[PDB]
Amino acid sequence: REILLPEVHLNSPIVKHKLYYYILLGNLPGPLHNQNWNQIAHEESNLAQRLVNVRNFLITHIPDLRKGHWQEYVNVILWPRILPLIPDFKINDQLPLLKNWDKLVKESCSVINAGTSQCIQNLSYGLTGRGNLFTRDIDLKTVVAAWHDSDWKRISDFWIMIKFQMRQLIVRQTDHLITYIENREGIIIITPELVALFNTLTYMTFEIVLMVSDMYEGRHNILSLCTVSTYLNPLKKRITYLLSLVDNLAFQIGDAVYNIIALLESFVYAQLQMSDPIPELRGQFHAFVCSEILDALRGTNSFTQDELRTVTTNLISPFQDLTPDLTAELLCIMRLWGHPMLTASQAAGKVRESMCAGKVLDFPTIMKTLAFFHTILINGYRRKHHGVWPPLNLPGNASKGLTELMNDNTEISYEFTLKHWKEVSLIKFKKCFDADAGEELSIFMKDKAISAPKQDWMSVFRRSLPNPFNRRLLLNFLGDDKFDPNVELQYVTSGHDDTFCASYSFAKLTKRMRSCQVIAESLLANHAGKLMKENGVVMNQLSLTKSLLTMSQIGIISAASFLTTDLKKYCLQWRYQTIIPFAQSLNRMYGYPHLFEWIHLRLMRSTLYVFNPPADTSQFDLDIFIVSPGIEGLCQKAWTMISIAVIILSATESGTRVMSMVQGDNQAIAVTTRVPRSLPTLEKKTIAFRSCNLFFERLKCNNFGLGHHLKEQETIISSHFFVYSKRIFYQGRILTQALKNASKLCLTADVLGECTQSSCSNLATTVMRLTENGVEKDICFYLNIYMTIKQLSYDIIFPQVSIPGDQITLEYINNPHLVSRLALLPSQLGGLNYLSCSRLFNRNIGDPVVSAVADLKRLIKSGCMDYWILYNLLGRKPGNGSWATLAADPYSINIEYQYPPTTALKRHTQQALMELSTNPMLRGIFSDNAQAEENNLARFLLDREVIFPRVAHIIIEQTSVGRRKQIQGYLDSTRSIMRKSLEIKPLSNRKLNEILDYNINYLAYNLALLKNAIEPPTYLKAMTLETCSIDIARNLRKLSWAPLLGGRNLEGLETPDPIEITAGALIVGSGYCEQCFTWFFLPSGIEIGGDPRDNPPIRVPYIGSSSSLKAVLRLAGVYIWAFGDTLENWIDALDLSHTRVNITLEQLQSLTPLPTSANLTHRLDDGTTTLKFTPASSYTFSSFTHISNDEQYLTINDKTADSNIIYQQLMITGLGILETWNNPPINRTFEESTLHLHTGASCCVRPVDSCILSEALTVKPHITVPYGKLTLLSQFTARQIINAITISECMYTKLDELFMYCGWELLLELSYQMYYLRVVGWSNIVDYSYMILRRIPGAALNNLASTLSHPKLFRRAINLDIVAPLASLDYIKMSVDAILWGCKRVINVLSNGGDLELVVTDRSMNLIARKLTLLSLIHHNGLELPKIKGFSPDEKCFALTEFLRKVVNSGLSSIENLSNFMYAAFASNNYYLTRKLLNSIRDTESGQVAVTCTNDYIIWIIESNANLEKYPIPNSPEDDSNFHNFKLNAPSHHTLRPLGLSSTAWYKGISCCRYLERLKLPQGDHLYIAEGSGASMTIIEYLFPGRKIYYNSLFSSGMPTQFIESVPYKLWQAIGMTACVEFIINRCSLVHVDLESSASLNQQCLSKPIINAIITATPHGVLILKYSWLPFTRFSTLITFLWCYFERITVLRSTYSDPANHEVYLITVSQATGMAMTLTDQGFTLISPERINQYWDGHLKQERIVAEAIDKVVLGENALFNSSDNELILEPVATFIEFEQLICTMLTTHLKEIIDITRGLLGKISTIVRLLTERILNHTIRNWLILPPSLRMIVKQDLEFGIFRITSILNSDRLIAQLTAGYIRKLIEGLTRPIQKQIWKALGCVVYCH
Amino acid sequence: LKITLEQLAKDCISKPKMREEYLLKINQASSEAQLIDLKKAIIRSAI
Ligand SMILES: [Zn+2]
């Protein structure tokens, strides 16, 4: 009762010692002991008393107290399962509380029922409309019913009540009798140690009840989740038949079934060994496992053959007609039957059998393996360095070793090694190498187990005829004196001393020995462990998962040879005599003698053990007990290393591309070959199988050679059957290992620190982990709801420390409404709903708070029948908190109860632990007033105008108190050390009062969130009527943090929430969406069954994509903000530096040069402290996906993960939506389907801000302990770019020199590679350059998207004649051919000229650079004599000298420069110079000037009734997704229609009018379909005859404007799918239509074509249709559809399109016939075979003509003789010459205003800054014709991408108004599509007016 | 084992009568090499 009631879920072994000891201590109906009972009954037990009252009570209540044969009186402890199944307590008068349980949960579920369904249905309408598909009904009622209409439930509730009674009893025992309970046909004996069951009677000890409760609740939850239609009756029948048969067999036999239980898990693999292509594997593994389980059963006399065969059939019957996922789930639940009860005999005997099995030492294999280990170590040390690998040996054999060593060969081949023995032994006794010891304070500050010295048995237990120790390394270690690894390693190199007694329980040792163990493990795994090859095990999650998934992927083509094994004896099999070579090698490598082997060494001379049958025994006894075998988990690091060694040796023995993972003892290996990749895939699997089979046999031979009983029962091979860490991979997927998590749906929290909150959190994450795989999301939402409800119920009724005192209990339980109203708000903003909705589609978070309020708003708008609650929580009492309280966490809302006692108790734990201290200089690391210092820093950081949480967070994390915080945080926090810390008992009673009744007051607070509270009227309406989650979160955080911080609202975060912003819509077959940005596409692709090569797409998977001086550097960089650079803030940084920097001589330099500028964006992330993370992820269908962002979301900018975060969130969202669309058992049944995320109608976009300030409170922490021309632009850009292949900013103010110099550098590198291999000047250079360039598309894709983009950059290059763009709309080739031209031009340079004075990014590499240059120079410049290669440093330098002195007599160019050939600029870092110099050119400079309508026609598509289809060539570029570049943004041409309009389109109209007058036509009626908002159509009538148009518009959620401004008075002088088109045809000459949509392989607007048909029917008037070939396939499909009943179709290119693909304008019996015609003609039909090239050259002509038009509009000319023709029907502010002085005055006044101001709600200044700049932009726009032409072209570039670099930069200098703000420069240097187009057309109007 | 290959057959071949007869014989067949032979016969007997 006093604190921390004991465990509620077992983590201790279940034994037979204890239960038998109890029951035989009592007098109740051959063990390993028969000693005495009366003496021990006297021996202070009280257990005898308890159990004898149990006995005599049973006697008075059994009829058969002492009879003949115990008629129905059986002490069945032989693990009965059908007997607990038996209605032991099924007296249907249920305990009264549980009826209330049922009533409450059912009624709450009913009241909350109707809202949530329509809630999620509306959420679906928001995404696409009727989501959650499967090919019945789902609802909350079904879930709750199934969970309360299922079996195994009542028994689980009974056992939970049992557990609760027993916890109450043991709590009583802690405080201080037992419980006797009578009832009809049954007896309830409840002791704090045993419970009785009888209606056939048995006993159960404590741990047993935990086991059975877990078992029953688990199977309950399993069949519950199975009840849902997703994974239906198949799995139900499976689990029920299996459970039944296994329980019956366990009854029939006993413990043996437990054994086969293990052997049963491996059995499903056998079925999943249905690798149907490759044979022999079925009959291999299925037969093996079946036969072995046959043995394991028949070994215990059930029956020989008949029973055996029948039980085997009935046991495998739950395994048929199941694809992998279901079978894997079936396994993960097949483990649900609890563990066996333990006893020393069996396990002790097995690990004893790990004794002598044959001293079979094989010197050849161990020597070869030591050699390969040396080689791997050497090559790794070479790679993870610039490289020395300095061995002080090898005098033995190899002069080849001599060469490849003295040259410092950075590579050492394995095949080279295999042909040698005894490669190297760095064996000495002198010094150390590449290692050091006494660091990484984590290891020996974290504790492990510990044994006792010689006198042990007494300390292990009593009952002999002697003292206990019960210490832990943590206690004494903290209380240790003068300790250090060095003294520890001295003990290591010291004694055979009789002070280590290996114990086992997975084993322990003594204090000093274990300390040496952890030290050694740290040293190896830190220094050597870094050296890694054939394993993606570097990090925890990203590399590990991606590596496993990708080895599975490369196994898949569009390699099928995998195997794996899991081994245990690999620990207890090793031998000293077979590991000491590695020992001494790595020993001398780390210098410190005899370090890496001593432990195992000592295990040769000693005895060990795991109660004990005595006669008189206390010392060394030849054998319970074991004498000197291998050990379980000690130094397995080296085990894994030698494992890698043997695997690589096997790989080299039989050459094959091998990739593996190996850790502990388990491993898995994939292998692939150079198979011809065209023939059918089956015999491909055959060849792969033969290869891996030879490999596996050789591996088995060698592995046994080293000595390893590796057998078949540990290994499994197949084609696509990877396994690791109980997660299996199959056919390139993570299997839906979901149902196991299902069984982990517990009913309470972790063992320590009981509290409701954390419980639900765990629960939440569990079900959220469930969300990751398999089961759909709606069931997960509903299940989280039900789980939270039922959990809060179980907590409120019979609380675990039940007391009926407070009335909060009754006020909660009396109404079901309240518990629903409390389980339906996002936990971050109070409540027990820990982010299951938003997180439902992204493991990343961004901010939860905005997500919390978004969830809230969405719920209420959908309706949980609580609206006032928002106002209540807004007006809720602002909590207290504290400065440091907020400091320690961003994303925070000051509420009373947001931290369970777990964190509080653990914090006080580590604190009171630090209190124990006699250690080294760690003293200052623990101080008394640290909290005062944290609050002082908080005051220093947050008491200012503009405030940001994350900066304070990181800045306190990195400062001096950062290390103290982290150190004191990463202690040990296990129950054991928890009690051992509570050994510091006086925490408080006040604090104890706080802890022991937490949940009471939390529920009381949420009770204060009862029925509606007072509502503040102002802010209510100021914030009600939901507008945006963003603003609600803003106002809430502000108002709730007011009590401390007051007015100022904090900002710097809160990117929005997905479900609010993005809505989108899918399209299948025929479909329309919202009027248009981004789009996900999915082709019609099947799962396995055809051919992976025939699986239509290419599988492109996508997922969520020198000292702590580093820390002080990040500190400064984030703190100064890199732009506000005063003496004050930098002095602050220096003071923080003196604060944290305690490592070397403290950093006293003036101004930190080395720290770079990184304040631009908020890229702050934290993690990566562990080694692995087991529950990785799940995704099964985002492989055939095809993402594409070619629609506007972003331009060239400096975002760098600013909006890429929300971009990434949109990617995840689309992937998840589509996955959920096809998550269950699926097939090709879905046709080509897309998702379009039209997200323009988002409630809030909330543009970004930027300003400066200074904090000033001058507080200091205190501790001092240990811990001219700019071709340089092209040069550095070529460096940074070509270095990647090995962004178009900084590539905007450039020319062809970039490509010139990148080609030059590439030539340098590749030519150095050429090593005299003949490459002639032009021919072979071109050849090998192509051969090396047309590879590795990734970085090429990058460079493409980066430079070849929409802006004039492509136009600039193509006008400079750099490339040649000639369906043919490709981009990537151009890019690489770009480099081509460079190289070509480069060669011309080397034809004559030795300029450009190469730069180095020390002296060795630049000498080598000169070497590269001379090498290429001669490689072309020879042609008279060859040359030889030799030494590295100067051989080719003297080659230069000699060959130059020769060719000086035979040359082609001028002679003088050849002399100058005799005769290196410097650099330090690319980032520094690149960025600082690109921002250095940002002054007044005009060097960039170096670069300084009836013209669109027809294509006249096809002739009348024409049927000669030609070579299709439907080839399409952009096969892989670069960044968005095809048609985004070229807003230039908008200036070509200056009107007073908004459409400006009808320029295309007059073009089509020209076309019309180019031919005859019928009478005029002017059909205008569904488009027009004051648009083109007018012109037609304005130029062609008609009366009373026939016109309509699309159904618009709200009548043409301009057309009614044009025609109607001149007349008065004298959307459709099926029905709208019908009304249209109800109301026959020309018609006009125009639309556009997203990707699809069919047509969806044929309605208007058939409309034209039937309307010209009601006679050959010609139409007008807008369309464009972005997907030329679809264009041709529409063209093929037209080529049926129509003839002489013509299409005409426009000049309103930007330079890009045009928006070109086109002029059988049934329609379905032509539809199917063209659709099936996807196969072999395309009808645009030749004129496409003419189209293309015409589009190039047009790009040139519009460039000329831009040139014209830079002047005062026009594009006249049609502007007036349109004006036939159809910002004046003052202009001045000194608008420069105007700008000066305006900036002066506005900056004075800014100084003045600083001296629902709003920001501060960003709005007025942007408004000022915009007004200045408009002024310059109006005054365009006042023009200093230099500035005119400058602003032309700017407003064309480089937007608005302020003009009067420094001339604005003309004191007080400047002295008040010195950051005017940054103010000077601080573009959206729509306003861009607006200002272009405004400039056009300006030029047309005057 | 016998029943394992019976299951393999049941899940491999098409004609229920031929399946029945191959089963009738494999329960009588007792030569492990001949079991492998009948197994390959089953696999290649999918036609
Ligand atoms: Zn919004």
Coordinates of C-alpha atoms in Angstrom, one line a residue, chain A residues 266-476:
Chain A
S266 CA 8.9 -23.3 -37.0
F267 CA 6.2 -25.5 -38.7
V268 CA 4.3 -22.7 -40.5
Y269 CA 7.5 -21.7 -42.3
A270 CA 7.3 -25.2 -43.8
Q271 CA 3.9 -24.4 -45.2
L272 CA 5.3 -20.9 -46.1
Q273 CA 8.0 -23.1 -47.8
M274 CA 5.5 -23.2 -50.6
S275 CA 8.1 -21.5 -52.8
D276 CA 6.2 -23.2 -55.6
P277 CA 8.6 -22.4 -58.5
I278 CA 11.7 -24.1 -56.9
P279 CA 10.9 -27.8 -55.9
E280 CA 12.4 -30.1 -53.2
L281 CA 11.8 -27.4 -50.6
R282 CA 8.3 -28.5 -49.7
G283 CA 9.4 -32.1 -49.3
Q284 CA 12.5 -30.9 -47.5
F285 CA 11.3 -28.6 -44.7
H286 CA 7.7 -29.7 -44.3
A287 CA 8.8 -33.4 -44.1
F288 CA 11.7 -32.5 -41.7
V289 CA 9.5 -30.5 -39.2
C290 CA 6.7 -33.0 -39.3
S291 CA 8.9 -36.0 -38.7
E292 CA 10.8 -34.2 -35.9
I293 CA 7.5 -33.3 -34.1
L294 CA 6.5 -37.0 -34.6
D295 CA 9.6 -38.0 -32.7
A296 CA 9.0 -35.3 -30.0
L297 CA 5.5 -36.7 -29.5
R298 CA 5.9 -40.5 -29.8
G299 CA 8.9 -40.2 -27.4
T300 CA 6.4 -40.2 -24.5
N301 CA 4.1 -43.2 -25.1
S302 CA 0.8 -41.9 -26.5
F303 CA 0.7 -44.4 -29.5
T304 CA 3.0 -45.4 -32.3
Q305 CA 1.4 -44.8 -35.7
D306 CA -2.4 -44.4 -35.8
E307 CA -2.8 -41.8 -33.0
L308 CA 0.4 -40.2 -34.4
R309 CA -0.8 -39.8 -38.0
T310 CA -4.3 -38.8 -37.0
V311 CA -3.1 -36.1 -34.5
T312 CA -0.6 -34.9 -37.1
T313 CA -3.3 -34.5 -39.7
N314 CA -5.7 -32.8 -37.3
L315 CA -2.8 -30.6 -36.1
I316 CA -1.8 -29.4 -39.6
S317 CA -5.5 -29.0 -40.7
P318 CA -5.4 -25.3 -39.6
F319 CA -2.8 -24.8 -42.4
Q320 CA -4.3 -24.8 -45.8
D321 CA -5.1 -22.4 -48.7
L322 CA -3.5 -19.4 -47.0
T323 CA -1.2 -16.8 -48.4
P324 CA 1.8 -15.8 -46.2
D325 CA 0.3 -12.9 -44.2
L326 CA -2.4 -14.9 -42.6
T327 CA 0.0 -17.7 -41.8
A328 CA 2.5 -15.4 -40.1
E329 CA -0.3 -13.9 -38.0
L330 CA -1.3 -17.5 -37.2
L331 CA 2.2 -18.2 -35.9
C332 CA 2.4 -14.9 -33.9
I333 CA -0.8 -16.1 -32.1
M334 CA 0.3 -19.8 -32.0
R335 CA 2.5 -18.5 -29.2
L336 CA -0.2 -17.8 -26.7
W337 CA -0.1 -20.8 -24.4
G338 CA 2.2 -19.6 -21.6
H339 CA 5.6 -20.9 -20.7
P340 CA 6.3 -24.3 -19.0
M341 CA 7.2 -24.4 -15.3
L342 CA 10.9 -24.5 -14.7
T343 CA 13.2 -26.8 -12.9
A344 CA 17.0 -26.9 -12.6
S345 CA 17.4 -30.4 -13.8
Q346 CA 16.5 -30.3 -17.5
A347 CA 18.1 -26.9 -18.5
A348 CA 21.1 -27.5 -16.2
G349 CA 21.6 -30.8 -17.9
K350 CA 21.4 -29.4 -21.4
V351 CA 23.9 -26.5 -20.7
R352 CA 26.0 -29.2 -19.0
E353 CA 25.8 -31.3 -22.2
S354 CA 27.5 -28.2 -23.6
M355 CA 30.6 -29.9 -22.0
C356 CA 33.2 -31.9 -23.8
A357 CA 31.9 -33.1 -27.2
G358 CA 35.3 -33.7 -28.9
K359 CA 38.4 -31.5 -28.9
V360 CA 38.1 -31.3 -32.7
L361 CA 40.4 -28.4 -33.5
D362 CA 40.9 -27.6 -37.2
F363 CA 44.0 -25.4 -37.7
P364 CA 43.5 -25.0 -41.4
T365 CA 40.0 -23.4 -41.2
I366 CA 40.7 -21.4 -38.1
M367 CA 43.9 -20.1 -39.8
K368 CA 42.1 -19.2 -43.0
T369 CA 39.4 -17.5 -41.0
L370 CA 41.9 -15.5 -38.9
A371 CA 43.5 -14.4 -42.1
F372 CA 40.3 -13.2 -43.6
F373 CA 39.4 -11.5 -40.4
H374 CA 42.8 -9.6 -40.6
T375 CA 42.0 -8.7 -44.2
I376 CA 38.5 -7.4 -43.4
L377 CA 39.8 -5.4 -40.5
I378 CA 42.6 -3.9 -42.7
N379 CA 40.3 -3.0 -45.6
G380 CA 37.8 -1.5 -43.2
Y381 CA 40.4 0.6 -41.4
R382 CA 41.6 1.7 -44.8
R383 CA 38.1 2.8 -45.9
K384 CA 37.1 4.5 -42.7
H385 CA 40.1 6.8 -43.0
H386 CA 42.2 8.5 -45.6
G387 CA 44.1 5.4 -44.7
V388 CA 47.3 4.1 -43.1
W389 CA 46.6 0.5 -41.8
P390 CA 50.1 0.4 -40.2
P391 CA 51.1 -3.2 -39.4
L392 CA 54.5 -3.6 -37.7
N393 CA 55.0 -7.1 -39.1
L394 CA 54.7 -9.5 -42.0
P395 CA 58.4 -10.5 -42.4
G396 CA 57.1 -13.9 -43.3
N397 CA 56.2 -14.7 -46.9
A398 CA 54.8 -12.2 -49.3
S399 CA 56.8 -9.8 -51.5
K400 CA 53.4 -9.2 -53.0
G401 CA 52.5 -8.1 -49.5
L402 CA 55.7 -6.0 -49.7
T403 CA 54.4 -4.2 -52.8
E404 CA 50.8 -3.8 -51.8
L405 CA 51.9 -2.5 -48.3
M406 CA 54.7 -0.2 -49.2
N407 CA 52.4 1.4 -51.8
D408 CA 49.7 1.7 -49.2
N409 CA 47.2 0.0 -51.5
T410 CA 43.9 1.3 -50.3
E411 CA 42.3 -2.0 -51.5
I412 CA 43.1 -5.6 -50.6
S413 CA 41.2 -8.2 -52.7
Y414 CA 39.6 -11.3 -51.1
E415 CA 40.4 -13.5 -54.0
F416 CA 44.0 -12.3 -53.5
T417 CA 43.8 -13.5 -49.9
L418 CA 42.3 -16.9 -50.6
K419 CA 45.5 -17.9 -52.4
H420 CA 47.6 -17.5 -49.3
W421 CA 48.1 -18.6 -45.7
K422 CA 49.1 -16.6 -42.6
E423 CA 48.6 -13.1 -44.1
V424 CA 49.6 -11.1 -41.0
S425 CA 49.8 -11.3 -37.2
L426 CA 50.3 -7.9 -35.5
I427 CA 51.6 -9.8 -32.4
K428 CA 53.9 -7.8 -30.0
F429 CA 53.8 -6.6 -26.4
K430 CA 54.7 -3.0 -27.0
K431 CA 52.0 -0.3 -27.6
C432 CA 48.5 0.5 -28.8
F433 CA 47.0 1.1 -32.2
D434 CA 43.9 2.9 -33.4
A435 CA 42.1 2.6 -30.0
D436 CA 41.9 4.1 -26.5
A437 CA 40.1 3.2 -23.3
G438 CA 38.4 5.1 -20.5
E439 CA 35.5 6.8 -22.2
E440 CA 31.8 6.4 -23.2
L441 CA 30.4 7.1 -19.7
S442 CA 27.2 5.3 -20.5
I443 CA 28.4 1.7 -20.0
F444 CA 29.7 1.4 -16.5
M445 CA 27.2 4.0 -15.3
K446 CA 24.4 1.6 -16.4
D447 CA 24.1 -1.5 -14.2
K448 CA 23.5 -5.2 -14.9
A449 CA 23.2 -8.4 -12.8
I450 CA 25.8 -9.5 -10.2
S451 CA 26.5 -12.8 -8.4
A452 CA 28.1 -13.5 -5.1
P453 CA 31.6 -14.8 -4.1
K454 CA 32.6 -18.3 -3.0
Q455 CA 30.1 -18.6 -0.1
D456 CA 27.1 -18.5 -2.5
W457 CA 24.6 -21.3 -1.9
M458 CA 23.7 -19.6 1.4
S459 CA 23.1 -16.3 -0.4
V460 CA 21.1 -18.1 -3.0
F461 CA 18.7 -19.6 -0.4
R462 CA 18.3 -21.0 3.1
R463 CA 17.4 -24.5 4.3
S464 CA 20.9 -25.9 5.1
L465 CA 22.3 -28.1 7.9
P466 CA 25.7 -18.0 5.7
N467 CA 24.6 -14.4 4.9
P468 CA 22.9 -12.5 2.1
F469 CA 24.7 -9.8 0.1
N470 CA 22.1 -8.4 -2.4
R471 CA 24.1 -5.6 -3.9
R472 CA 24.1 -4.2 -7.5
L473 CA 27.0 -2.7 -9.5
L474 CA 25.1 0.5 -9.6
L475 CA 25.0 1.1 -5.8
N476 CA 28.6 0.4 -5.1

